[PDB]
Amino acid sequence: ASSERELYEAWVELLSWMREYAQAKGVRFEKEADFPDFIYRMERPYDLPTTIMTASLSDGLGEPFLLADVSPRHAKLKRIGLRLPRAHIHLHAHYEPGKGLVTGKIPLTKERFFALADRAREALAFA
Amino acid sequence: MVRVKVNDRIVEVPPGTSVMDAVFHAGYDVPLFCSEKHLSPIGACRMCLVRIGLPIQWQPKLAASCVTAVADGMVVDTLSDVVREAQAGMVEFTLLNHPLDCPTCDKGGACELQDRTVEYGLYEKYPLELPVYTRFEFTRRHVDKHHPLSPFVILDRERCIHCKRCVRYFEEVPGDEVLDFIERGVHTFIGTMDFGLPSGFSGNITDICPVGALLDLTARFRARNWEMEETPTTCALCPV
Amino acid sequence: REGILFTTLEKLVAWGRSNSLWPATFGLACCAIEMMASTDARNDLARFGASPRQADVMIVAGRLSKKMAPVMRRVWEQMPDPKWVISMGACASSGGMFNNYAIVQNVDSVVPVDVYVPGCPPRPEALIYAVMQLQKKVRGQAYNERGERLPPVAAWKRTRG
Amino acid sequence: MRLERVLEEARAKGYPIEDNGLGNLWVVLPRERFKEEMAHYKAMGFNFLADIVGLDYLTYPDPRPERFAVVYELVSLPGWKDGDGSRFFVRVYVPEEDPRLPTVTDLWGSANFLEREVYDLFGIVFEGHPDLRKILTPEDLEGHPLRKDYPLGETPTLFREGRYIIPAEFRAALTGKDPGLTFYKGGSRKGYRSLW
Amino acid sequence: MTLNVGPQHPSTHGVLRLMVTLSGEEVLEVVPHIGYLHTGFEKTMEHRTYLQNITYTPRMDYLHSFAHDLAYALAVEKLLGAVVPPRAETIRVILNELSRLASHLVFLGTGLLDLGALTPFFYAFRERETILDLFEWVTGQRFHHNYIRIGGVKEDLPEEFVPELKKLLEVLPHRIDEYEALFAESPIFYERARGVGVIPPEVAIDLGLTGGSLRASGVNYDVRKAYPYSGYETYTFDVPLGERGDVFDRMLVRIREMRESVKIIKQALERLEPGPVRDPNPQITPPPRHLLETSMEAVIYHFKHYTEGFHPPKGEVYVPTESARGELGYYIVSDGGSMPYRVKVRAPSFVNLQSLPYACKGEQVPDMVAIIASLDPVMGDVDR
Amino acid sequence: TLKALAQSLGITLKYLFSKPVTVPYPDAPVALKPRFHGRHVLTRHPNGLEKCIGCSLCAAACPAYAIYVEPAENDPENPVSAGERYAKVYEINMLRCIFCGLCEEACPTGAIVLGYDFEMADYEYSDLVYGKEDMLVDVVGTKPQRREAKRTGKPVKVGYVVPYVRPELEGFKAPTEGGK
Amino acid sequence: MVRVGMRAAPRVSLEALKAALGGLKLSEAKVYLITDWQDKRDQARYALLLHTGKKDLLVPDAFGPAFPGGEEALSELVGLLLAQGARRFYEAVVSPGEMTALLDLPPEELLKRVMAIANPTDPGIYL
Ligand code: SF4
Ligand code: SF4
Ligand code: SF4
Ligand code: SF4
Ligand code: SF4
Ligand code: FES
């Protein structure tokens, strides 16, 4: 559906949350990758709310403890995922209309994410 | 010497020969990622796959020519419709999760992936049919990108095709396992818990990498491979 | 007397020349055919002579072969003095797309260039721009990128010899 | 029909026959039989002499019999007396250390300028020519430009602050004997052909 | 009097140098001297991609350039075994013939001026301008258009090209006739050109004068007919001819060629329906620009194609084509490299010239000018 | 054939009394076709981000070798282009340039795209090697044009008009048609 | 081929050249000026290769305004070629990087490269 659009908007949202946890703890955030379908989009039109495909939270050493990504505008079975490096931890965010952003049947709130990020920093982050 | 015939031509070739080398020795060719000069072949990237006969008696499944020994009076097929189809296939599996960086990639003009892909890839299916480059229409593997491993060495985990070349190298040649794969399946990636990239030999992996995963930081973003004037010389820094 | 030394008189003659600028074409390649278009639209210029003797402006239009250089040399020398050189197109101006044994890699080697006109071939209206350049150049109305005012005649600046 | 009479003649006398499936055909005569055989060729009804094309194979990846090879193009005009439309190449290899070859000037006056060009650009001297004068390359040019051992003669293309490009050090494109930028080249980049 | 008609002066056209061995008002023998335009493509092009060369192909015969484009494109396609789409082929015949009308328009413009007088250069120039506007419309360039591709052609035709080709296809029949009107009934020209310029067919054949200055002396050979290529095999096609080769007949033959060319333009214009425009084989043709933002294979192939280019099989190849100056064709030796091993260009204008010491032998001096213009050389093709 | 002299004159007469043909550049602006090959332009995305990711494939595509691109790494805080890479130097020697547009055609991001300007004739060789900051979509004029327009303070008028600008030039403002 | 002079030292090189030419008549000689950079003669350096036809002579890059009092040296050089009746002057353009390597090559090779790249030039620009 046009759920796609609300998904990209929500993706922008999640990025915002990453940036915040980043400043809060004095621990590095990084924009990893932009959209090929924007970069290599030439004259072609681009309506997406941002141009950004991949991001992360890195420790002092720059090794990431948290990773986050959204599907390109043109891919089938669109998802946004989360991955914890080294920990074999994979999470899949969908979007149910009216409810909000969900992992399967479980609502994904900002809070849930901040807790996951702190556990991540304290466990995984080397410095 | 052991008598081998590759495609339309015949070669003398010493007994312990890799089928790949008997191939190339006959003046032919075959995709090559995991295996490396001075490195253990392990049929890993599975690029070098060819056909072998031993009497006309063809073996059932394909030999990785890199990890196959050669036997006396042996036949090797590299141009068959089925072989080229298979080669194209492995190439497509490799290209399956890749990042899309060529214009912006430092591995630039000379990438074993780029060149192997353009050599052997997209086998001819049968007119001016309008064909598709890409079948897979799902989301790619996205990981950590542009990560400095040492003041001299940079890491893109997305580009890595999981040949064994760098880790293999570290254990075999210098003997410092400061690099190895981490998780498994498609999730697998290069990382280190020895942070400096300690070895005084660390920069060679930059040369070995068939792709741009491992690049040379001192020369990052300077010019494209073709664009340099390249001056072959000898290093006067020490007596070797 | 070269058009000089009364503020009224020199300006007067200098217009005379700029607006009179009398092209003597020196065709070489496809560029010459792109100047034969310029012949159509033209209105201080396109009467010729054609004979070199009779003209101020030399238009080098085309690839100038190395064997061809000493020729163009004398044609330029065999022009009356208050004379200007326009260099037309890439082959003339620099070595162009033919970078090699055959062709002069800048015509400025053999004849003093006044004005350069890029393109392969340049549109004719660009050559009008160049003769307006050279028009306004000999009026002493012309400047480079460094801030400097440009002399009416280049080849008032080379040592002949 | 006059072409068949050429091939049938070449097979008996042991003349090798080259063929590409593009529709182009060659006949290589030895040096000896060349002058006379080709005299016989004009005599055979060959109106028109199209080309003399000089070839320097020095840098060609595979070896050939001799370094330079010349190809003449003989034809019989289709709209003339009885024209087949029979056109074909006759190739003659020539030694590096012996750039000799008889002119067909007597036969065709076409042979006049073309053989001179092949003299200018390659060192090849054509016997019996009315006038072998240098044709194309500047009077005081030394040597023979289009033979491979002779520099293309590039000059750097020029930019702003100490910035240059040396084309031959800039070139992305590879020749036949070029390795390429990886460990080797296979496949399409060792040569490719689509199958119709 | 060995009179020395110089390199560029006095109006010996296109930078030729002529040693007219001449006592009196006749002409003994002209000893021709060329080489003044020698750019050295055959070497330069050994240093360019097969794609890169397509920028160097139009540049030799700059009047009928697309005949270069066509010949080279074809010889390579053949050599690498590529399949050219029908609409591309049709467009290539249209452009070839339109470029021919351009070239011819030029030839007779200069001819009429060269001896005789000034006026009709301008009308030919007007029609040529409509043609050049057509070329600019489709290729973005006046000439040297980088359009034809080894697959096919660079991109498709815009909306506005069709309407404008018709306009000129409408005026031209009346128009070509107007040029003809002045000429065929030649007032002075008849007593100027009819006698001068002797061409025996046998010597034309002996010296190898192929280029449509051949049919003016009564030999019937056209490459579009004798050795058909781009589907000229399939057109309603008239080949004009001359009686005894003089200046006059050559001169009118090409004018007839212009209406027949226009008839080919109309004919091909009729047969044109929507489709794709170049051979999709990625080895041959760089990927579609839109999917550079999606496919891995796309990006790889884009990068590779525009840097290295492609490698045709080891082989030699040649294909013959018809320009407005005669037999044209590229002899391409490929070594399986990204750049041709060697490209020798069969230059029609170069072989056509062996018959000028013959042609203007015994002719007048004022006529020795006219007899040159009548032979229609282009020096870029000659020196080269 | 005596009659011809007469008819010859006649047609010319017809043509004298027919007045019209020609365009008086620069006083009347030349009409250009939309695909014409002009002064190179670098283009930007809606974001304002430059299309140029500085990959120098325009330069590799170049038969005249007229394009020099020194590459560079994007600054996370304040970015230039959409990748991690952009063009630190873009020089084009107009004098070296043959005007194919193989650069544009090679260009992966639709960065390098030939423009509409032809009034670039200039007095000095090295003034003719254009840099990036002479080529961006925002710029209106050629070098001598702009320089005259500053030393005069009289604004630039280009001597051309087009029916419209191509999709690939998006952002490039030009005098068009009666669109204005 | 002989090689005289040394890089970047105008007056010594000029005095030595004056010594070496002698009563040699130059009417059939060809004079090649080797330089980097077509446009800017103001900061230019110049090396010279003289092909007399009966023997060749190399001078490194010691000439031009690039070095102090160098301009007057190049000017007197060309003047002196002109006096002995040299006529045919040529200009050769090399990369700056080339210039050192070029003159360390063997005589024959260097000379063929020079004749291949050299552009006919007006002697007057060096006066
Ligand atoms: S690793 Fe090779 S294929 Fe991948 S982006 Fe870099 S150059 Fe392209
Ligand atoms: S980083 Fe490179 S060398 Fe190491 S396994 Fe990955 S692809 Fe092979
Ligand atoms: S600049 Fe272009 S149009 Fe002019 S002579 Fe050179 S190739 Fe021909
Ligand atoms: S138009 Fe052609 S010559 Fe000019 S920069 Fe582009 S590729 Fe090079
Ligand atoms: S203009 Fe295009 S081709 Fe050139 S460097 Fe920029 S993105 Fe790459
Ligand atoms: S090359 Fe043999 S499997 Fe990697």
Side-chain angles (χ1 to χ4, degrees):
Chain A
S2 69
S3 68
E4 278 196 34
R5 186 214 59 248
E6 200 59 42
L7 177 48
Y8 288 108
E9 207 188 295
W11 156 244
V12 181
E13 194 72 58
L14 181 281
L15 290 167
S16 160
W17 303 347
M18 288 196 52
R19 276 206 209 74
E20 180 158 330
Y21 176 93
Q23 206 270 306
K25 305 305 152 156
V27 70
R28 296 269 312 212
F29 163 87
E30 226 192 323
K31 174 182 85 48
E32 232 67 58
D34 293 69
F35 275 110
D37 71 294
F38 170 76
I39 305 157
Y40 305 129
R41 139 264 141 100
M42 297 183 285
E43 57 288 327
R44 278 176 306 282
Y46 195 81
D47 73 332
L48 294 175
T50 33
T51 62
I52 177 170
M53 175 176 54
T54 312
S56 81
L57 298 167
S58 313
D59 55 37
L61 270 36
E63 276 254 41
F65 48 81
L66 172 296
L67 287 150
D69 71 292
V70 67
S71 43
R73 184 180 182 276
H74 300 128
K76 295 291 185 290
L77 272 96
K78 292 169 200 301
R79 67 182 179 87
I80 150 184
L82 292 163
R83 179 179 179 171
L84 300 198
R86 293 190 300 278
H88 55 68
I89 281 180
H90 312 77
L91 280 54
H92 287 248
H94 309 284
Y95 173 80
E96 279 299 322
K99 341 283 189 182
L101 200 65
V102 292
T103 65
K105 301 159 53 199
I106 292 67
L108 183 38
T109 61
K110 183 172 213 154
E111 297 79 8
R112 176 174 185 208
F113 177 75
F114 263 69
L116 179 63
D118 261 311
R119 290 254 316 300
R121 193 194 75 252
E122 309 200 309
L124 280 180
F126 299 83
Chain B
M1 294 200 269
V2 156
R3 215 119 176 179
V4 185
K5 191 178 133 280
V6 185
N7 267 115
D8 66 64
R9 277 183 236 123
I10 308 154
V11 222
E12 296 302 320
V13 73
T17 296
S18 163
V19 170
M20 172 148 83
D21 287 291
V23 166
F24 277 94
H25 184 37
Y28 289 82
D29 51 326
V30 58
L32 175 57
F33 285 153
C34 83
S35 315
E36 178 59 280
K37 297 149 187 197
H38 306 288
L39 290 195
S40 59
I42 1 96
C45 73
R46 297 214 85 42
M47 280 298 187
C48 65
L49 305 197
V50 295
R51 203 177 192 190
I52 285 189
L54 205 39
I56 57 171
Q57 263 188 38
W58 295 125
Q59 312 257 260
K61 46 186 180 162
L62 303 146
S65 68
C66 86
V67 287
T68 307
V70 295
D72 215 321
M74 178 189 62
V75 175
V76 185
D77 188 4
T78 85
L79 313 110
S80 277
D81 285 321
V82 184
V83 160
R84 278 190 311 94
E85 178 181 342
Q87 284 180 170
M90 212 72 71
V91 166
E92 159 174 27
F93 293 140
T94 294
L95 290 181
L96 201 95
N97 283 312
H98 208 72
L100 281 154
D101 294 351
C102 295
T104 184
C105 194
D106 243 357
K107 220 324 177 288
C111 165
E112 313 198 26
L113 175 54
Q114 257 191 351
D115 303 37
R116 248 79 293 177
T117 280
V118 83
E119 285 164 348
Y120 301 108
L122 304 170
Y123 153 86
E124 215 165 284
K125 291 185 293 297
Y126 277 134
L128 192 144
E129 190 180 2
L130 177 63
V132 77
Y133 296 95
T134 194
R135 295 247 283 280
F136 183 81
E137 43 181 71
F138 298 86
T139 309
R140 292 167 179 280
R141 186 206 294 113
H142 289 129
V143 291
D144 172 66
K145 217 156 175 59
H146 49 81
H147 182 63
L149 279 195
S150 95
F152 298 124
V153 168
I154 206 173
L155 180 60
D156 199 309
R157 297 157 180 202
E158 294 175 344
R159 285 182 205 149
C160 171
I161 73 202
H162 315 68
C163 77
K164 221 172 183 179
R165 274 182 177 193
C166 63
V167 331
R168 212 147 96 251
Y169 159 83
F170 270 127
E171 185 280 334
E172 276 150 41
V173 169
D176 288 314
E177 280 144 310
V178 289
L179 216 55
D180 214 332
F181 304 112
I182 300 308
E183 295 183 30
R184 57 171 157 62
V186 277
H187 290 308
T188 305
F189 67 89
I190 291 287
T192 188
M193 268 221 263
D194 304 278
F195 306 99
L197 269 278
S199 97
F201 296 91
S202 77
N204 278 339
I205 57 182
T206 281
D207 296 347
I208 318 178
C209 198
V211 284
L214 299 172
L215 297 164
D216 170 7
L217 203 31
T218 198
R220 147 167 275 245
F221 282 18
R222 283 273 198 87
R224 313 302 305 276
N225 297 62
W226 63 93
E227 266 173 314
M228 347 241 156
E229 193 179 353
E230 308 188 312
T231 303
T233 192
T234 304
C235 162
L237 270 151
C238 95
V240 319
Chain C
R1 353 189 110 279
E2 309 148 76
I4 202 188
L5 298 175
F6 204 110
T7 138
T8 301
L9 204 167
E10 52 162 300
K11 295 306 162 39
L12 153 72
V13 57
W15 110 296
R17 303 221 220 233
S18 63
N19 305 105
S20 167
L21 288 170
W22 225 257
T25 173
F26 195 79
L28 302 162
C30 10
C31 271
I33 297 191
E34 209 65 312
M35 179 171 173
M36 279 159 55
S38 65
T39 65
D40 264 274
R42 256 299 188 36
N43 271 202
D44 297 319
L45 59 59
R47 253 21 128 268
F48 268 147
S51 324
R53 299 296 202 161
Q54 304 176 343
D56 58 303
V57 163
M58 181 173 176
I59 299 161
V60 181
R63 23 245 182 60
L64 197 276
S65 168
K66 282 186 214 177
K67 155 203 197 126
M68 172 54 140
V71 149
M72 186 194 50
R73 191 23 184 188
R74 294 179 203 84
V75 186
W76 174 91
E77 290 163 313
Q78 270 145 64
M79 228 172 287
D81 234 296
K83 75 201 160 188
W84 292 270
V85 167
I86 287 172
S87 176
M88 180 170 174
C91 298
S93 309
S94 50
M97 103 182 95
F98 307 116
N99 200 321
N100 46 236
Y101 72 89
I103 303 279
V104 189
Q105 296 276 331
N106 181 353
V107 173
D108 194 81
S109 284
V110 273
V111 305
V113 178
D114 283 277
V115 174
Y116 287 90
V117 57
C120 176
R123 188 159 195 84
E125 297 83 70
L127 178 64
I128 278 84
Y129 192 76
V131 309
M132 295 195 81
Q133 223 61 265
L134 184 71
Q135 229 193 351
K136 142 270 217 79
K137 191 199 187 208
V138 324
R139 308 183 208 242
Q141 208 188 291
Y143 313 78
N144 61 33
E145 281 282 306
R146 322 193 62 195
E148 314 180 49
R149 173 190 311 279
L150 298 158
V153 188
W156 258 210
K157 309 184 295 80
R158 234 185 242 249
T159 326
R160 299 268 161 178
Chain D
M1 281 190 83
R2 294 190 155 152
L3 178 50
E4 308 164 351
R5 282 194 266 291
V6 174
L7 304 188
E8 296 173 350
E9 171 152 8
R11 292 183 149 178
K13 218 152 173 187
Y15 299 154
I17 306 292
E18 295 177 350
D19 190 41
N20 66 65
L22 303 176
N24 314 125
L25 280 67
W26 285 257
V27 175
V28 55
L29 321 168
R31 187 101 141 288
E32 298 87 358
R33 311 294 311 172
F34 161 69
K35 176 51 198 184
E36 47 200 60
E37 271 291 332
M38 203 138 104
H40 167 51
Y41 277 98
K42 160 173 168 180
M44 201 176 314
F46 284 127
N47 280 288
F48 173 54
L49 171 55
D51 264 49
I52 295 98
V53 53
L55 262 49
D56 179 20
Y57 279 109
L58 176 70
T59 321
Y60 192 75
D62 310 309
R64 287 309 159 89
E66 295 301 320
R67 179 185 166 176
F68 307 90
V70 167
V71 165
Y72 300 76
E73 203 181 328
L74 322 163
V75 189
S76 308
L77 295 191
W80 220 206
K81 301 179 183 298
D82 44 5
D84 290 347
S86 67
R87 141 184 303 213
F88 82 114
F89 303 62
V90 178
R91 176 171 319 187
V92 281
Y93 293 79
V94 175
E96 189 203 49
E97 205 140 314
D98 207 40
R100 290 158 35 88
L101 206 64
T103 70
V104 284
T105 293
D106 325 313
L107 298 64
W108 298 273
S110 316
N112 173 39
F113 287 176
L114 272 162
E115 279 176 330
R116 293 177 57 189
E117 189 198 20
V118 168
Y119 163 72
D120 203 344
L121 307 181
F122 310 80
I124 288 163
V125 176
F126 282 82
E127 302 301 40
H129 216 269
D131 64 330
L132 273 191
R133 307 178 292 107
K134 176 168 287 189
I135 283 204
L136 274 183
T137 68
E139 199 54 69
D140 48 288
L141 204 100
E142 196 166 309
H144 305 275
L146 292 179
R147 53 204 227 169
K148 301 297 205 150
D149 67 333
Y150 188 111
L152 153 66
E154 317 193 278
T155 298
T157 84
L158 294 206
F159 301 91
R160 272 210 155 114
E161 297 174 350
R163 275 175 291 260
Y164 55 84
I165 294 185
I166 303 146
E169 302 282 359
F170 188 85
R171 259 172 199 49
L174 335 166
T175 200
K177 275 166 109 94
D178 236 285
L181 292 173
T182 59
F183 300 162
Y184 72 100
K185 64 203 172 132
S188 302
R189 59 187 291 268
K190 218 153 101 177
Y192 165 77
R193 177 112 132 235
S194 181
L195 293 317
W196 56 296
Chain E
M1 299 176 183
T2 294
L3 161 72
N4 187 22
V5 181
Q8 189 69 60
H9 297 83
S11 295
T12 188
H13 77 227
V15 55
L16 165 61
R17 176 211 187 204
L18 284 194
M19 294 298 292
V20 197
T21 300
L22 157 50
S23 294
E25 218 38 57
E26 283 188 320
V27 167
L28 280 297
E29 60 174 29
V30 188
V31 176
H33 296 117
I34 58 171
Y36 280 113
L37 264 201
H38 173 64
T39 287
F41 298 74
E42 290 190 7
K43 174 73 129 189
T44 308
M45 272 179 152
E46 296 180 18
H47 297 101
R48 257 62 164 170
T49 301
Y50 292 90
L51 167 50
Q52 261 190 339
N53 286 322
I54 306 172
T55 57
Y56 281 60
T57 49
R59 264 98 186 170
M60 296 135 99
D61 178 335
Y62 30 87
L63 282 165
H64 197 214
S65 81
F66 202 86
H68 276 284
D69 284 36
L70 185 62
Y72 170 80
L74 292 173
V76 180
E77 307 161 339
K78 295 253 308 156
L79 178 61
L80 59 76
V83 304
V84 194
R87 170 167 204 193
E89 186 206 63
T90 309
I91 294 178
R92 267 143 81 129
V93 315
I94 297 173
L95 293 175
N96 195 17
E97 298 301 276
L98 199 51
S99 174
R100 190 188 298 275
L101 306 167
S103 154
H104 266 9
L105 270 174
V106 158
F107 138 81
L108 64 82
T110 49
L112 275 68
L113 176 62
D114 259 3
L115 189 145
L118 28 164
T119 350
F121 163 51
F122 285 58
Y123 312 60
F125 171 84
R126 183 208 132 197
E127 278 60 272
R128 193 200 162 73
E129 283 296 306
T130 327
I131 295 185
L132 287 192
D133 291 323
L134 288 168
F135 288 140
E136 197 170 329
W137 264 109
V138 39
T139 76
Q141 285 182 293
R142 307 266 288 178
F143 33 84
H144 304 320
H145 8 252
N146 187 16
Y147 193 70
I148 202 165
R149 294 290 172 261
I150 311 294
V153 289
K154 190 188 177 136
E155 52 196 20
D156 217 329
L157 302 172
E159 317 95 65
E160 293 96 316
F161 177 78
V162 206
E164 307 309 314
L165 182 44
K166 301 191 153 275
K167 238 193 145 85
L168 170 140
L169 239 43
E170 176 178 17
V171 56
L172 268 203
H174 141 226
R175 237 11 272 198
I176 296 133
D177 285 36
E178 248 195 59
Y179 311 100
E180 173 157 54
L182 276 67
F183 251 14
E185 296 300 320
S186 29
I188 315 92
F189 179 59
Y190 200 112
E191 220 171 283
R192 292 305 311 267
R194 179 67 70 185
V196 290
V198 293
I199 317 162
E202 269 260 310
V203 174
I205 282 188
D206 175 67
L207 313 180
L209 186 146
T210 311
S213 148
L214 176 63
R215 82 204 55 172
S217 80
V219 179
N220 194 66
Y221 169 56
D222 184 322
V223 182
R224 321 180 263 180
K225 289 292 211 177
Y227 302 119
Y229 36 77
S230 95
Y232 276 3
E233 205 215 350
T234 76
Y235 286 85
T236 307
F237 212 20
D238 282 297
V239 195
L241 283 147
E243 302 283 302
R244 170 64 94 165
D246 60 11
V247 173
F248 181 93
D249 267 329
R250 273 177 279 209
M251 198 73 54
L252 288 193
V253 168
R254 300 205 172 85
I255 305 190
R256 307 277 172 76
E257 291 208 343
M258 297 202 302
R259 273 180 242 101
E260 272 310 284
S261 281
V262 174
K263 280 320 166 107
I264 305 313
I265 310 267
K266 305 187 195 188
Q267 208 178 316
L269 188 158
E270 294 173 339
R271 72 172 66 198
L272 210 35
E273 187 184 298
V277 297
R278 43 185 309 196
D279 179 10
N281 188 354
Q283 299 282 340
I284 317 192
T285 284
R289 289 179 64 85
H290 68 272
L291 58 80
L292 222 49
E293 70 195 79
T294 265
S295 161
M296 192 50 68
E297 291 95 336
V299 176
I300 297 178
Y301 277 59
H302 165 280
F303 192 101
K304 217 59 198 188
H305 186 268
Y306 286 109
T307 63
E308 179 179 359
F310 52 83
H311 303 221
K314 289 169 257 174
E316 303 160 2
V317 82
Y318 178 91
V319 304
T321 193
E322 183 85 321
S323 76
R325 270 152 213 90
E327 193 185 321
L328 176 52
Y330 284 82
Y331 181 76
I332 306 179
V333 177
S334 175
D335 63 338
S338 208
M339 310 175 304
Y341 187 80
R342 182 176 180 272
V343 176
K344 194 278 198 272
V345 188
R346 180 216 139 77
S349 312
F350 183 68
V351 293
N352 272 231
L353 217 76
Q354 302 196 80
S355 305
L356 184 80
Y358 191 98
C360 66
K361 173 185 212 161
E363 305 294 341
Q364 200 63 84
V365 197
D367 284 305
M368 191 210 53
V369 190
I371 193 167
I372 280 175
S374 61
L375 269 184
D376 195 14
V378 160
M379 291 300 287
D381 212 313
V382 180
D383 285 334
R384 187 177 67 257
Chain F
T1 76
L2 278 66
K3 36 272 286 181
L5 285 106
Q7 308 188 316
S8 170
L9 277 52
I11 78 92
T12 49
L13 186 158
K14 308 179 179 198
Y15 274 102
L16 186 177
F17 297 85
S18 150
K19 296 180 194 10
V21 182
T22 194
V23 311
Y25 167 83
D27 298 318
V30 133
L32 299 174
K33 317 312 141 200
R35 293 184 183 175
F36 167 74
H37 295 25
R39 175 183 70 65
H40 302 59
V41 330
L42 300 182
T43 56
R44 321 160 172 276
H45 292 288
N47 321 63
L49 296 175
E50 294 188 349
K51 289 195 182 198
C52 189
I53 75 177
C55 73
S56 205
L57 293 176
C58 46
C62 180
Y65 317 118
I67 305 174
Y68 195 93
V69 179
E70 268 198 32
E73 163 136 48
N74 270 317
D75 178 8
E77 197 72 14
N78 188 41
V80 176
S81 61
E84 15 165 317
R85 187 181 180 117
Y86 76 97
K88 179 195 185 185
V89 167
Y90 205 95
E91 274 125 16
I92 284 173
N93 187 268
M94 301 288 150
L95 300 195
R96 239 3 125 120
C97 184
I98 231 54
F99 292 63
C100 346
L102 280 145
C103 46
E104 169 185 349
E105 184 175 359
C107 180
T109 70
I112 197 54
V113 194
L114 313 189
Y116 295 129
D117 319 69
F118 53 83
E119 297 174 291
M120 53 179 53
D122 211 311
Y123 309 79
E124 274 207 323
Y125 189 118
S126 294
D127 281 347
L128 279 163
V129 47
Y130 283 41
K132 188 173 167 162
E133 74 298 321
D134 295 307
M135 300 186 261
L136 272 34
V137 296
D138 16 307
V139 75
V140 177
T142 72
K143 255 156 144 196
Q145 260 186 322
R146 295 207 314 281
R147 177 173 74 238
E148 158 172 344
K150 288 175 63 177
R151 79 197 159 196
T152 309
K154 193 62 198 151
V156 178
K157 61 177 174 61
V158 277
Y160 63 73
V161 287
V162 294
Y164 54 76
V165 315
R166 328 193 265 174
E168 305 90 31
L169 286 182
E170 63 185 343
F172 187 72
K173 298 293 182 289
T176 62
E177 190 70 318
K180 172 162 178 148
Chain G
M1 182 181 83
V2 197
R3 177 176 190 160
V4 315
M6 67 175 283
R7 172 180 281 86
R11 269 155 295 189
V12 184
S13 299
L14 182 53
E15 162 190 37
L17 181 59
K18 272 170 186 183
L21 179 56
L24 188 54
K25 326 197 156 219
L26 299 172
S27 50
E28 268 78 355
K30 282 179 202 159
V31 187
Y32 302 95
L33 288 153
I34 326 185
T35 171
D36 57 326
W37 233 267
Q38 278 164 271
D39 195 11
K40 294 185 175 71
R41 308 229 194 259
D42 287 314
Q43 32 190 235
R45 63 171 67 217
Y46 292 96
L48 189 146
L49 178 63
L50 188 48
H51 188 80
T52 71
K54 279 151 205 207
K55 60 159 139 224
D56 302 312
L57 198 147
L58 191 58
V59 180
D61 46 306
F63 298 110
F67 321 106
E71 191 168 336
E72 200 169 54
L74 174 65
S75 184
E76 292 188 13
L77 153 62
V78 182
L80 169 70
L81 301 158
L82 276 162
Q84 295 303 72
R87 291 185 177 277
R88 304 182 288 194
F89 294 90
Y90 303 82
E91 181 171 292
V93 191
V94 304
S95 59
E98 249 174 276
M99 183 105 43
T100 354
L102 183 78
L103 330 161
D104 294 315
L105 313 163
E108 60 185 342
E109 274 156 279
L110 157 69
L111 173 70
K112 192 198 205 166
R113 163 62 136 199
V114 159
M115 291 177 301
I117 60 169
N119 284 318
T121 192
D122 176 6
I125 53 173
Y126 314 98
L127 301 203

